[model samples]
Target: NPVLETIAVDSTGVSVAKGQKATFKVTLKDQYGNKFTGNVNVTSDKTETATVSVSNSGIGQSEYTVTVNGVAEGSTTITIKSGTKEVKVPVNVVAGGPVANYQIKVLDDGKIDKSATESPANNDVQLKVYAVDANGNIVGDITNDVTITSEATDTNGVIVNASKSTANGDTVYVITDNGSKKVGKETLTVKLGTVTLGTVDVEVIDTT
Candidate 1:
């Protein structure tokens, strides 16, 4: 009866895109360096970043296959535990598919407001942005690839907070009041690299 002494993986790490999966091989061995396969627990440290699943039926003799699924754009670690031995592998998840279009939505009361509206001297307008493929599937976070700008020529007291305009995970643009008590409109433009994705028009109202 040999006990689990060491755990080894064939791949140095894993990388995949959201809504995609990648696989690697794992080998369980004993003190004698002999292949030992039985039961092992596989897990990902950040489930929001990536997920893992394991199966014992590998192409290699007595080898286990670990499948990693990307959930979001980030990095996480996968741990393979067997008895007292544990092995960790790094995993990187990125946006899924290619960018085709940009989806923009105005939020009201922490929810998507279909009837989007904004007013002057009010900094309550928030826009949720997303990158989608040609098939209309959400690509993923584009925080690192996109830029936001406020095209408000008039002094409506509305502008984009450059310091607070980056997406943490979900891309959202925070429109703030620029301290101008005037009523005007603003054009917010979003760009990916040099390509223009789309723009949103903010209507300033002084409805007292």
Candidate 2:
């Protein structure tokens, strides 16, 4: 027999933005630790803050998925039950808006010079880039929506590359020496289709 006490939930809670949806999974097991099929019911304590929909795997599978859609910016709790087994999930909803600006953090051993046009001693510079919306919400990724370009006045020994971050939906631009080594200024530019965000300059000096 399926044991209500053996119900397992994958997540304690979920956080999403208004007009977005997030999901969590639930698994059912019998007294003998076998997968069992059964009817599952779900309810939200606050229907105005958010709502939930559920789906299950095919027959003989004990996996169920619950998707919570954010209707407004608020918090709520959802309850899931299969027979006597029950689990509660917390939901947090945040504001939603379009990407408004890009925040660039230069992770390097050098100082940035905006007025003098001469960057301090920098051998390798990495520009950690992330996006923000009009509401100041951090946008996930823009690799597909935007374009990045870089060039150096003296490209003999300097190399520049722009790639997506492996850890998050962000982008990283790297400016370094290309083995031979060069001492000059490199410009990295970012654009959303035709709208250019801005260009950043980095002076690469020969450390060794």
Candidate 3:
């Protein structure tokens, strides 16, 4: 019997506000890379009055699961079926809460001194900013633009921007058209100034 493989979200879990609509997706394919066309079923454990549906459009690449008035919260298995084959996937639903804290960390450096910590010994290495409304959520658009700049006063009393950079996974840094180097550091600093929403961090380790 050809078993129907389970479907899963690309991300580990999802976060949504109460009464807001949420969508999850999974890719369907046979062991041989053939697209599977079949009915998919999504069920939740929480028994929250929620509507569930699958996209009839993209059979494989564009498949998605959407939920409305999501009340079911926590991990639940979503089953996908095609003929006699079936796939089960785990889905998690989290309550949308206020953005209480913002954090930043350094992951790796593209080309700099290798002495810098790539993965900090403390998982708590993230710099945290507090004081957010209980109903406030991080603005998705401004999440990545959160910048952290560092500067230290040398013996000569000269303050220079910390030489650091970031890339990939969440926050990212790239060269800008203005010809000024934008630097984001793993540790939080006052130099960056006014991050709108969410947390920002850097991965600084000499990849070069």
Which candidate number maximizes TM-score?
2
What is candidate 3's lDDT per residue for 1-208, written digit by digit as tens? Answer: 3334544345344444444444445655555555444455555434453445566542444245444234555545445555555555444444556555543322222223233354422212223222222444221222244554433332222122332233453333331111113322332253224644433333333322
Q: After superposition, how far is residue 22 of candidate 3 from its true place, in Å?
A: 2.3
Q: Model 2 scores what on Cα lDDT? A: 0.64
Clashing pairs in 2: none
Where model 2 places Cα greater than 4 Å from the true spot, the runs are 56-61, 96-208
What TM-score, to 2 decimals, does candidate 3 have? 0.36
Which pairs clash in the backbone of model 1?
157-178
C-alpha lDDT of residue 24 in model 3: 46
What residue runs in model 3 are displaced by over 4 Å at the alpha carbon?
A: 1-9, 15-17, 57-62, 72-77, 91-95, 100-208
* Per-residue lDDT value at 2 in model 1: 82
Judging by lDDT, tell me the better candidate of 1 and 3: 1
By lDDT, the best candidate is 1
Give me the displacement of residue 191 in model 3, in angstroms: 20
Residue-level error in angstroms, candidate 1, position 15: 0.9
* Ten contiguous residues minimizing lDDT sum, candidate 2: 109-118
- Please rank every candidate by lDDT, starting with the best: 1, 2, 3
